[PDB]
Design a protein around this ligand. Structure first.
Ligand SMILES: CCCCCCCCCCCCCCCCCC(=O)OC[C@H](CO[C@@H]1O[C@H](CO[C@H]2O[C@H](CO)[C@H](O)[C@H](O)[C@H]2O)[C@H](O)[C@H](O)[C@H]1O)OC(=O)CCCCCCCCCCCCCCCCC
Ligand code: CLA
Ligand code: CLA
Ligand code: CLA
Ligand code: CLA
Ligand code: CLA
Ligand code: HEM
Ligand SMILES: CC1=C(/C=C/C(C)=C/C=C/C(C)=C/C=C/C=C(C)/C=C/C=C(C)/C=C/C2=C(C)CCCC2(C)C)C(C)(C)CCC1
Ligand SMILES: CC1=C(/C=C/C(C)=C/C=C/C(C)=C/C=C/C=C(C)/C=C/C=C(C)/C=C/C2=C(C)CCCC2(C)C)C(C)(C)CCC1
Ligand SMILES: CC1=C(/C=C/C(C)=C/C=C/C(C)=C/C=C/C=C(C)/C=C/C=C(C)/C=C/C2=C(C)CCCC2(C)C)C(C)(C)CCC1
Ligand SMILES: CC1=C(/C=C/C(C)=C/C=C/C(C)=C/C=C/C=C(C)/C=C/C=C(C)/C=C/C2=C(C)CCCC2(C)C)C(C)(C)CCC1
Ligand SMILES: CCCCCCCCCCCCO[C@@H]1O[C@H](CO)[C@@H](O[C@H]2O[C@H](CO)[C@@H](O)[C@H](O)[C@H]2O)[C@H](O)[C@H]1O
Ligand SMILES: [Ca+2]
Ligand SMILES: [Cl-]
Ligand SMILES: [Fe+2]
Lengths: 34, 33, 62, 446, 34, 29, 30, 322, 108, 65, 28
């Protein structure tokens, strides 16, 4: 139960963390034209 | 729980026979040269 | 004397409501728009004063 | 102009993207409307307004706001003198008369582009500096008003009080609460059941002490932006361009809506249940107690009991140490209203105390919230949902939350609309896929 | 207020006229003619 | 009502009027 | 009996999905 | 670098399924929704709506056809509280109070949102005008409305939609009891929005199939003549134009496909938005106007117009529910 | 008020004003104005203690709230008429329990 | 532009009268705003069977109070 | 001719019902 709590936090924190940098790094640079 | 005793065959034939009839036609098409 | 003032009150709208028409039309035909019409500076400066009569008087009136 | 340089008419406003001289004309005029609408409703409501009865009875969405700042309210929610209500609305009208007048001036006779008449006012959307310069001033000005609230709070008159030791009305805050302990950490609370996110705000003095920060944060913001310039990581993202600025505005403005939808519907502290009408949770809550007292009054003891549903007739013991009402109301055991909390004891309601501690106002007021439990129709067929043609109303508290939501919903779409057109524009292919070279045409084919 | 006691239609309808602006836009398009 | 209704009809008909006067003027649009 | 048919029927749906997404013959251009 | 290379892989279009940055949320959450769904749908302990009396078995293992089976929403005892696994005392406690419902819809919604964007951030990377995500808002509006919003108006997810084919029917009917949704105008547009969608879907489907430049023999299938990537126009507008242009008056025929297809996609969408507004208007107890005793004689008797019949039927239902 | 420090000392301190000000001469130069400013302290008083989540649990604090809401609530409706004696006596009997029960918390 | 200042007014007034005159009442047999329940006897004058109704509608209507 | 026969036989009764609509709203 309690172990699961921290686990969900860590997992959710990870994606969202992995998520923002995608846009915070050069996202418009990825596209057919510029 | 209690059930129509024969109702199971219904599904099977209603699943397989239409299914099969689509396969047989298909496998043919695959064999077209 | 609110009637004395109520007539002056409506005199705001009457004068405003025409300037509501006049100001845009003044800009409508640019010919002599700002050339012929200084009435804005003539009407507006007179119009703003017609606001001050409203409240300062009514504060004493009503 | 015409479509020749531009695009079609039904969308024709965005022809203004590159004309700033016309652009100010838009806003100042538009702001003129919003102002003019504000005072209009004020006077419109004031003419049909009845000072004796309560406000939520009147179907009144505005005067409560003015009142909530403590003008003409009086204790007991008396609504003493209407003249302060009158002054507010008319002033906005007179203010609008100036605005649109200017809005017109920039619309026509004002210069069609500002890059020349005033270089200071001149700005290019693509410029990431002179624009950010502007973002400072507003963020300063918008921060000024926040303080100017507190000027009403701490100094001039005093703001409304939800909870007073009696009457729950008018107080001039002395010491505002400020520290990151209960402020920054305040919004850190869960959004969900039992802990509001920003919707808790138990104490009034939270918002005042809170706005102090938002007052002194924003003033830093301008001073920050005025003296700074976007950094690298900023420049790599965000698509600096005319549209996107509007696109970002929406997203922020959208999420604001859902929050504003949440306050009016729940929070009792900021919007007093008194003249905004009872909150939905409080409605069934108070009704549940009026049934309680009327039966407990006469020859019946409801404390230890069972119901036909089995949970008891009125009181239950929650899994928490506190004991609550039964019925459907049990879904709201979290609500604490100005009248209810004192009736509550250390853990839940003190039954022995409930009988004795009733006031003349409470029971009356708590019963006054029985008639109005937010409900009603678009033609305003009121009473309990299927109750037939009796007590016809829709509590204004229900209107705002409905209204602002619908609007707030669109602005999510709007945000998600322009953000598409903004980036695609910057990406250059917003004009439609190019028939010469299709980007997909040459790709690895899966 | 009693000093203001009668302007019936004006105070009756102020708030509709903001809508009228949206309508004006079309008429102001009608003469311009799209 | 009717008196009030007449007052409302009279009170804000500058919209159409404005355009018509402007149209006659052939000002700008 | 009763339930186990539904899961079966519902299974072949999924076994179709995964199967129909990846194994489709690509419709080449021209 | 690993990152700069990895980032290039997520964004990359060569994948058979595009996963944008939204896919980073979308894929795990939905894949987590479904897994915890199908299981919970198959084996659900008899979730209890009210701790007073009555456990409800919507699970598939207990005697339920697909029709009757549904995931019961959370109880009233739990109210609207955020009720994750660990917060609940015991695992079986978390199921008995209707946890799996509150678990699915969160991951589903928060999955559904990121999907709405994932359609966008693909469209941006194929170099195409990106309005699909606008069109997709219409269902997603309805999703949030019936799942997330409406219970907030009721303060409990219990009144939220039980998700299942019988559960849904139960929902509407009961929802019809309280708020009289039929007479509400916003819904009454939503109907038009759906039909006219289905309607236009038939005509614009029909008229273009009607007109086909014939590359096929009569024996051969008519479809196969279309070659993927034909830069010929496969369907005559001039032929089909006058058709609908003769059938009704020639003025309304919508010469321009680009004009048509937009209107084809505006009618259903805008039709649906009003519903997801019509619900949110209901969730706050602002109901559809029910004209009642609109007629009365001089004798005070009730002439009893139709709406009363409905007013009675609803009044009938509400007593039934409780 | 002039409230400072912890809740306890001030809670006791306010009762020194509360229990006193209940019954005084009505014909004195000011009982009202004296009773006016005395009850204004309640406003100052009970505002800051609403903020406390701790004392929001235990009895002795919520006891005082029962007293405060009893007393002050009379003064918005019709403050001019003095309280009924039956409402006056019950106040002290509540205060008397409080500071004892209040003390029951610290030395529990 | 010619008779369209004539046709419309004279015609539109006809419809105005058939309501005012109430001629539409006995033409379409609608009940009159006071006429539903003759005497008191509050009940539905529900027409029942065939080869009757022409005579049966008379009965309900016959009383009329 | 042809067109005239359409509107004349259609919109004319419309003008005649508008009498019934309006002249009703003032009854009762
Ligand atoms: C497209 C359409 C988008 C729709 C999806 C987004 C909906 C937006 C939700 C608005 C955000 C604010 C939610 C909120 O303030 O959330 C609060 C609301 C209701 O909050 C309730 O608030 C109650 C507050 O009551 C008390 O608190 C009040 C405020 O403090 C007063 O103190 C008063 O005493 C008393 O009423 C309690 O805190 C309850 O526990 C809590 O459920 O909940 C909520 O819907 C919580 C769920 C929303 C979270 C969504 C997650 C998004 C990431
Ligand atoms: C913050 C406010 C805001 C601002 C300033 C802009 C600004 C702009 N938008 Mg925009 N937009 C916003 C919010 C905003 N948007 C939101 C929230 C949405 C989602 C609904 C959109 C959706 C949107 C689209 C889809 C388009 C724009 C476009 C534009 C550009 C031209 C304006 C235009 O088309 O007017 C057009 C004005 C009209 C068509 C007249 C209004 C007619 C509507 C139907 C009124 C109906 C509302 C009313 C309440 C309902 C009926 C009343 C009822 C009683 C019956 C301009 C840059 C256009 C563009 O291409 O941008 C470059 C465009 O095509 N916007
Ligand atoms: C309600 C907000 C609003 C505002 C502020 C504007 C403002 C503007 N629009 Mg616009 N527009 C709007 C809504 C709005 N629009 C909507 C809803 C639509 C869709 C229906 C459009 C569609 C549209 C198109 C298609 C175009 C504009 C254009 C313009 C600009 C020039 C218009 C012009 O030549 O005026 C000239 C106006 C007149 C000659 C007469 C107007 C009538 C007057 C102003 C009435 C006065 C108001 C009031 C009665 C008096 C107040 C003052 C008083 C105190 C004295 C201007 C900045 C044009 C543009 O691109 O800018 C160059 C353009 O091409 N708009
Ligand atoms: C926030 C709203 C806003 C903004 C940004 C502007 C911006 C501007 N106005 Mg302006 N104006 C507005 C509202 C606004 N106006 C309104 C509401 C009115 C009606 C009272 C006017 C009436 C007005 C007039 C009469 C004139 C301007 C002028 C100007 C320009 C120069 C002003 C200047 O530097 O003065 C310098 C003063 C100080 C720095 C002090 C500038 C583009 C002037 C102009 O056209 O120049 C291009 C001008 O003569 N405005
Ligand atoms: C509305 C006013 C406003 C606006 C539009 C901006 C706009 C901007 N600021 Mg800024 N700023 C403001 C107010 C404002 N600021 C104030 C009041 C301060 C305090 C003095 C600052 C201090 C500040 C600094 C110190 C810096 C900026 C910077 C910037 C630029 C890029 C960074 C950015 O926007 O962050 C976008 C947001 C992120 C990058 C991360 C988001 C993290 C947030 C805070 C999450 C917080 C948790 C949240 C509650 C989670 C909830 C989930 C959500 C779904 C609700 C941008 C132009 C940067 C810049 O370019 O300056 C050179 C910079 O270095 N600002
Ligand atoms: C409803 C979901 C949704 C969707 C699909 C989009 C879609 C988009 N947004 Mg966006 N946005 C939204 C809501 C949404 N917006 C809200 C509510 C805000 C608050 C102001 C913003 C603020 C915003 C900014 C400031 C920018 C975008 C931008 C964009 C574009 C892609 C870049 C990006 O990463 O977005 C940003 C994505 C987010 C902010 C994520 C919020 C919603 C997602 C779906 C949830 C992700 C998980 C979330 C953090 C919660 C999980 C953890 C939580 C428990 C703490 C794209 C059009 C960019 C753009 O187009 O600029 C031109 C851009 O710069 N958005
Ligand atoms: C008794 C009633 C009416 C009479 C006798 C009448 C008379 C006529 C006649 C004789 C014509 C054909 C000659 C001409 O166009 O000058 C005509 C044309 C027309 N009138 Fe009327 N009119 C009547 C009512 C109406 C109404 C109710 C309308 C409503 C719009 C209307 C609108 C028109 C139109 C649209 C035409 C053009 C016919 C076409 O284009 O084929 N008229 N009218
Ligand atoms: C008592 C009374 C009264 C009176 C009052 C008055 C006295 C009024 C006032 C009012 C006001 C007091 C007004 C004024 C004006 C103002 C305005 C409306 C302003 C605005 C503007 C703006 C804002 C501009 C802009 C800008 C620029 C241009 C530049 C720089 C920046 C800025 C932004 C500033 C009355 C009659 C009501 C009646 C009732 C009572
Ligand atoms: C430009 C343009 C536009 C826009 C417009 C606008 C936006 C406007 C605004 C407007 C406005 C924003 C207005 C304002 C003004 C105001 C005024 C004009 C006022 C009047 C009134 C008054 C003055 C009052 C009086 C009184 C008193 C004082 C007391 C009591 C009584 C009374 C109420 C009477 C459009 C798009 C359409 C089109 C294009 C162009
Ligand atoms: C407490 C309180 C108060 C105060 C206020 C405050 C303190 C607030 C704050 C708030 C805030 C201050 C908020 C914030 C939030 C966050 C957000 C919402 C933002 C936005 C942005 C973002 C979100 C970003 C975005 C992005 C992402 C996410 C990824 C990457 C890309 C980008 C960067 C774009 C008051 C007095 C009223 C009352 C009582 C309580
Ligand atoms: C009076 C007055 C005033 C002023 C105000 C104003 C000046 C307003 C404006 C107004 C307006 C602003 C108006 C407008 C007009 C409009 C109208 C009259 C509308 C109607 C409608 C229309 C005509 C539409 C059209 C159409 C149709 C019908 C169908 C198709 C579509 C369309 C859209 C085209 C004041 C404040 C001083 C206050 C005192 C009094
Ligand atoms: C990605 C796909 C994942 C799919 C996951 C699920 C796959 C697992 C399938 C295993 C199915 C076992 O099927 C099982 O059949 C039996 C009998 O047939 C059912 O049992 C049924 O009949 C028995 C008696 O025979 C009763 O005691 C029982 O109460 C009744 O439910 C079970 O309720 C069902 O669970
Ligand atoms: Ca009226
Ligand atoms: Cl008294
Ligand atoms: Fe099609």
């Amino acid at each position: 139960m309690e172990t699961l709590k921290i686990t969900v936090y860590i997992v959710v924190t990870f994606f969202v963390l992995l998520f923002v940098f995608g846009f915070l790094s050069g996202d418009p640079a990825r596209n057919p034209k510029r | 729980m209690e059930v129509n005793q024969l109702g199971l065959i219904a599904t099977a034939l209603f699943v397989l026979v239409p299914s099969v009839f689509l396969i047989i036609l298909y496998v043919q098409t695959e064999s077209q040269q | 004397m609110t009637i004395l003032f109520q007539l002056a009150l409506a005199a705001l709208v009457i004068l405003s409501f025409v300037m509501v028409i006049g100001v845009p039309v003044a800009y409508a035909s640019p010919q002599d728009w700002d050339r012929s019409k200084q009435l804005i500076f003539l009407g507006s400066g007179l119009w703003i004063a017609l606001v001050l009569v409203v409240g300062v008087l009514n504060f004493f009136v009503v | 102009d015409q479509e020749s340089s531009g695009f079609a008419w039904w969308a024709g406003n965005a022809r203004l993207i590159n004309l700033s001289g016309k652009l100010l004309g838009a806003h100042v005029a538009h702001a003129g409307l919003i102002v003019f609408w504000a005072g209009a409703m004020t006077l419109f409501e004031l003419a049909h307004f009845i000072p004796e009865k309560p406000m939520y009875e009147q179907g009144l969405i505005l005067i409560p706001h003015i009142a909530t700042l403590g003008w003409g309210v009086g204790p007991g929610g008396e609504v003493v003198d209407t003249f302060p209500f009158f002054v507010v609305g008319v002033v906005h009208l007179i203010s609008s008369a100036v605005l649109g007048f200017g809005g017109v001036y920039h619309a026509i006779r004002g210069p069609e582009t500002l890059e020349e008449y005033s270089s200071f006012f001149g700005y290019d959307w693509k410029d990431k500096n002179k624009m950010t310069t502007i973002l400072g001033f507003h963020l300063i000005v918008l921060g000024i008003g926040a303080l100017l609230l507190v000027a009403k709070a701490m100094f001039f008159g005093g703001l409304y009080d939800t909870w007073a030791p009696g009457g729950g009305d008018v107080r001039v805050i002395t010491n505002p609460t400020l520290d990151p302990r209960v402020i920054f950490g305040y919004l850190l609370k869960s959004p969900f059941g039992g802990e509001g996110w920003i919707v808790s705000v138990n104490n009034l003095e939270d918002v005042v002490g809170g706005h102090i920060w938002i007052g002194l944060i924003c003033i830093a913001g301008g001073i920050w932006h005025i003296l700074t310039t976007p950094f690298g990581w900023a420049r790599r993202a965000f698509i600096w361009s005319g549209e996107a600025y509007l696109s970002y505005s929406l997203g922020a403005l959208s999420m604001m809506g859902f929050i504003a939808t949440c306050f009016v519907w729940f929070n009792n502290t900021v919007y007093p249940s008194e003249f905004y009408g009872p909150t939905g949770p409080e409605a069934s809550q108070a009704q549940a107690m009026t049934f309680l007292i009327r039966d407990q009054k006469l020859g019946a003891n409801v404390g230890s009991a069972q119901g036909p549903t089995g949970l008891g007739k009125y009181l239950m013991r929650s899994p928490t140490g506190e004991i609550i009402f039964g019925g459907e109301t049990m879904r709201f055991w979290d609500f604490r209203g100005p009248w209810l909390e004192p009736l509550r004891g250390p853990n839940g309601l003190d039954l022995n105390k409930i009988k004795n501690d009733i006031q003349p106002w409470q029971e009356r007021r708590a019963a006054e919230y029985m008639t109005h439990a937010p409900l009603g129709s678009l033609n305003s067929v009121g009473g309990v949902a299927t109750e037939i043609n009796s007590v016809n109303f829709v509590s204004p508290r229900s209107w705002l939350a409905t209204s602002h939501f619908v609007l707030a919903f669109f602005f999510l779409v709007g945000h998600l609309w322009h953000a598409g057109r903004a980036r695609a524009a910057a990406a250059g292919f917003e004009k439609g896929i190019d028939r010469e070279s299709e980007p997909v045409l040459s790709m690895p084919s899966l | 207020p009693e000093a203001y006691a009668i302007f019936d239609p004006l105070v009756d309808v102020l708030p509709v006229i903001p809508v009228l602006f949206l309508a004006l836009a079309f008429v102001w398009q009608a003469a311009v003619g799209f | 009502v009717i008196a009030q209704l007449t007052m409302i009809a009279m009170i804000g008909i500058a919209g159409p009027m404005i355009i018509f006067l402007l149209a006659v003027r052939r000002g700008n649009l | 009996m009763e339930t186990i048919t539904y899961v079966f029927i519902f299974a072949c749906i999924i076994a179709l999905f995964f199967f129909a997404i990846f194994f489709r013959e690509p419709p080449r251009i021209t | 670098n690993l990152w700069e290379r990895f980032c290039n892989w997520v964004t990359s279009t060569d994948n058979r399924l595009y996963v944008g940055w939204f896919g980073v949320i979308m894929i795990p959450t939905l894949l987590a929704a479904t897994i915890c769904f199908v299981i919970a749908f198959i084996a659900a302990p008899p979730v209890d709506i009210d701790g007073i009396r009555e456990p409800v078995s919507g699970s598939l293992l207990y005697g339920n056809n697909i029709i009757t089976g549904a995931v019961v929403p959370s109880s009233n005892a739990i109210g609207l509280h955020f009720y994750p696994i660990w917060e609940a005392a015991s695992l079986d406690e978390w199921l008995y109070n209707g946890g799996p419902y509150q678990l699915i819809i969160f991951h589903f919604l928060l999955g559904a949102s990121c999907y709405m964007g994932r359609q966008w951030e693909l469209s941006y990377r194929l170099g195409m005008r990106p309005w699909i995500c606008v069109a997709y808002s219409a269902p997603l509006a309805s999703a949030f409305a019936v799942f997330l919003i409406y219970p907030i108006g009721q303060g409990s997810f219990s009144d939220g939609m039980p998700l299942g084919i019988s559960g849904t029917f139960n929902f509407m009917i009961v929802f019809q009891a309280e708020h009289n949704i039929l007479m509400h105008p916003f819904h009454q547009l939503g109907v038009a929005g759906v039909f006219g969608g289905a309607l236009f879907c038939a005509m614009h489907g029909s008229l273009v199939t009607s007109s086909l430049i014939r590359e096929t023999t009569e024996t051969e299938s008519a479809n196969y003549g279309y070659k993927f990537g034909q830069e010929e126009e496969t369907y005559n507008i001039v032929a089909a134009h006058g058709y609908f242009g003769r059938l009704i008056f020639q003025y309304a025929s919508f010469n321009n496909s680009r004009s048509l297809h937009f209107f084809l996609a505006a009618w259903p969408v805008v039709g649906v938005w009003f519903t997801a507004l019509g619900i949110s208007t209901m969730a706050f107890n602002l109901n559809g106007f029910n004209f009642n005793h609109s007629v009365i004689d001089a004798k005070g008797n009730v002439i009893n117009t139709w709406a009363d019949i409905i007013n009675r039927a609803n009044l009938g239902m509400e007593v039934m529910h409780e | 008020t002039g409230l400072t420090g912890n809740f306890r000392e001030d809670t006791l301190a306010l009762i020194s004003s509360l229990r006193e000000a209940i019954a005084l001469p009505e014909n004195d130069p000011n009982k009202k104005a004296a009773q006016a400013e005395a009850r204004k302290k309640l406003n100052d008083f009970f505002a800051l203690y609403r903020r406390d989540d701790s004392l929001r649990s235990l009895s002795s604090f919520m006891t005082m709230q029962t007293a405060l809401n009893s007393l002050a609530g009379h003064y918005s409706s019709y403050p001019n008429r003095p309280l009924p004696e039956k409402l006056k006596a019950r106040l002290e009997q509540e205060f008397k329990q409080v500071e004892l029960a209040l003390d029951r918390e610290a030395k529990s | 532009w010619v008779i369209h200042s004539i046709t419309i007014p004279a015609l539109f007034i006809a419809g105005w009268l058939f309501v005012s005159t109430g001629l539409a009442y006995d033409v379409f047999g609608t009940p009159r705003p006071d006429s539903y329940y003759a005497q008191e006897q509050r009940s539905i004058p529900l027409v029942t069977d065939r080869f009757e109704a022409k005579q049966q509608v008379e009965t309900f209507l016959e009383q009329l109070k | 001719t042809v067109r005239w026969v359409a509107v004349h036989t259609l919109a004319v009764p419309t003008i005649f019902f508008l009498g019934a609509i309006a002249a009703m709203q003032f009854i009762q």
